[PDB]
């Protein structure tokens, strides 16, 4: 049976997905050090008691409740506040 020659694709590559995004919910209690948000750049900024790691990961510095908040007109941040 007749069979034609086929070409090749130069595509077929992709990197591993990095599981970015929110790691804890607004209103959730977290312990100090818990990662809050994985990101490239500052899509979300560190707020109160929140640090920004070398790769922009947002993390809690204290035990407390996570709160995602507006930051100005276009930006936002995430904060952690100690519970009473």
């Amino acid at each position: 049976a007749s069979k034609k020659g086929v070409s090749s694709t130069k595509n077929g590559r992709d990197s591993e997905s990095k599981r970015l995004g929110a790691k804890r919910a607004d209103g959730q209690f977290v312990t100090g050090g818990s990662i809050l948000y994985r990101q490239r750049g500052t899509k979300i900024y560190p707020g109160e008691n929140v640090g920004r790691g070398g790769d922009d990961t947002l993390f809690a510095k204290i035990d407390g409740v996570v709160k995602f908040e507006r930051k100005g007109r276009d930006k936002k941040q995430v904060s952690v506040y100690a519970v009473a």
Binding site: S2, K4, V6, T9
Partner: protein, 136 residues
Amino acid sequence: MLLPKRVKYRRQHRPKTTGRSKGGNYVTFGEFGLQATTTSWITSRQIESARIAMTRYMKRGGKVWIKIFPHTPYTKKPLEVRMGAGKGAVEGWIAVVKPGRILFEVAGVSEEVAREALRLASHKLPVKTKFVKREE
């Protein structure tokens, strides 16, 4: 033969064809228009055929507007080849048309001439159509 001078991507996902016409649903340049009532891809070759038909009937008296443009390349595999081994090469260019879109408009002729010209045009197209006027 309409086609973009260039595109960023030559190999594109084929467009969605369900739904209604997003825009261009009114006669806006001429007096009379040809309104699509069914859905189809419309090729540059079909556009050109319809344009020539209507302009030749109008005998250069009036003005014609093509309201749709074939932005989208579609590919096709080479003859008698098996599935896989990448996407095929660009075959042509199409405009997606859904019910309500005005395909052509005409001005500067009588309503009777416009009707006959747009009838001749519609017979070249893969969609059902209706003669439409400017609304007010």
